[PDB]
Design a protein around this ligand. Structure first.
Ligand SMILES: C=CCCn1nc(-c2ccc(O)cc2O)c2cccc(C(F)(F)F)c21
Ligand SMILES: C=CCCn1nc(-c2ccc(O)cc2O)c2cccc(C(F)(F)F)c21
Lengths: 10, 229, 232, 9
């Protein structure tokens, strides 16, 4: 689970 | 159907200009970094904070939103350093012989071990941009091209074409002749090969920094690094 | 100079006439190959191609106007990119496969695999664009002149002048093929963006080459070793 | 080096 995944969602 | 394709050249330019991330500052403290730990510490910290702004910028680049989350992740993982670098050389244009990582962080070549090579490449790129009189509108087009192109391995190609139209649009608007237009287009796009080169070299240096484990690296910067491996 | 006086058509003619030959590998279907020997075929082939590339480079308009030191630098920077674009060019008509030699056609299986897929994608790109031989030779000359241009000051200016002339030749070819102005600009950009990926593939290849050196199992020619040394 | 002399002749 990449931080980039989270940031691209918010 | 993507909205990006329906945009006019001026709409595209306005969208890109309005999406521009802010220019961030490094730590205050006029202590000139003349060491590995200090300099790289400031650069990684800066890159860390810029990454957050870059992610929000990318989402505002026409066509980027139309991609799946996984595709957006891939493009950013491939292009992030190229994007930071082209921004650097853009800010450094008016500071010949120097690199303006931040308004309060101006470095010259006299400052780290194997790093000078990349430093000189960045300086040469900035100088090249200066002598070409690169315009802000052109810079933003090039930066979006890097985002969409570097990891592009039909929608993106379509979008990339529109940006090409937009670049030519700007040049014609600036009064350039037809031959001057395609010549300048070629010149700008060829520089992207060198920015790619610098990115790959910088990534190898970032990797050494990791394995030497002296300079603190954020988990985000580490995951971006791992992606390249 | 001499490259600055050439017409677009004369430029294309010269480049076509300067094309190097397609060499064979030492591949033998009866001989069992280990991962090392497989790479041996590719390194052996590259070494023999280099001699032909060096002589092809001399025939690239404007190249001989440079100092021997600058000619050396350009080739040291571009050699793998040039080999790669040559590969993807002759692989165009072989979808899902790379034609390293007339006697060495490989797909991703048997085929390091990441670079393989990138070469496949590049060849696939050229095929859809229906890249013309005239365009290919222009692109290859651009790589030679551009890859090391940013690594006196009059030399680079001359280099940039010649590069501009090749752009004029590319546009000339596209206009000749019936493309509208918009289509010309778009195709020009499309071709040049591919050179960014070719640079990337070369960068990754140079790293694998270094790895092969350190493992000391795949034979590397003296020239290949010197090429690698310059790179780092 | 090799590249140099190959270019020279
Ligand atoms: C002369 C060496 C440059 C390498 N480099 N440059 C950055 C960087 C940071 C912020 C920015 O706005 C623009 C930039 O080019 C950078 C960040 C992390 C690691 C490296 C290095 F290549 F040194 F590992 C960086
Ligand atoms: C499966 C791709 C590996 C990369 N690669 N490709 C060549 C090569 C040789 C001859 C030719 O006509 C075209 C080519 O692309 C090559 C040569 C030396 C080393 C590598 C390496 F795998 F190390 F990147 C090469």
């Amino acid at each position: 689970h990449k931080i980039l995944h989270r940031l691209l969602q918010d | 159907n993507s909205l990006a394709l329906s945009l006019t050249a001026d709409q595209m330019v306005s969208a890109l200009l309005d999406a521009e991330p802010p220019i961030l500052y490094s730590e205050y403290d006029p202590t000139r970094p003349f060491s590995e730990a200090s300099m790289m510490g400031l650069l990684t910290n800066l890159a860390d904070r810029e990454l957050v702004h870059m992610i929000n910028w990318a989402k505002r680049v026409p066509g980027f939103v139309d991609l799946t989350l996984h595709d957006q992740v891939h493009l950013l993982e491939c292009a992030w350093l190229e994007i930071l670098m082209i921004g650097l050389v853009w800010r450094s244009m008016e500071h010949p012989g120097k690199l303006l990582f931040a308004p309060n962080l101006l470095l010259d070549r006299n400052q780290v071990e194997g790093m000078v090579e990349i430093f000189d490449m960045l300086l040469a790129t900035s100088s090249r941009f200066r002598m070409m009189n690169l315009q802000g509108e052109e810079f933003v087009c090039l930066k979006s091209i890097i985002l969409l192109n570097s990891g592009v391995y039909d929608h993106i190609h379509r979008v990339l074409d529109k940006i090409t139209d937009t670049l030519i649009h700007l040049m014609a608007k600036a009064g350039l002749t037809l031959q001057q237009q395609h010549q300048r287009l070629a010149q700008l796009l060829l520089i992207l090969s060198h920015i790619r080169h610098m990115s790959n070299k910088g990534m190898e240096h970032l990797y050494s920094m990791k394995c030497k484990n002296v300079v603190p690296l954020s988990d985000l910067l580490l995951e971006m690094l791992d992606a390249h491996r």
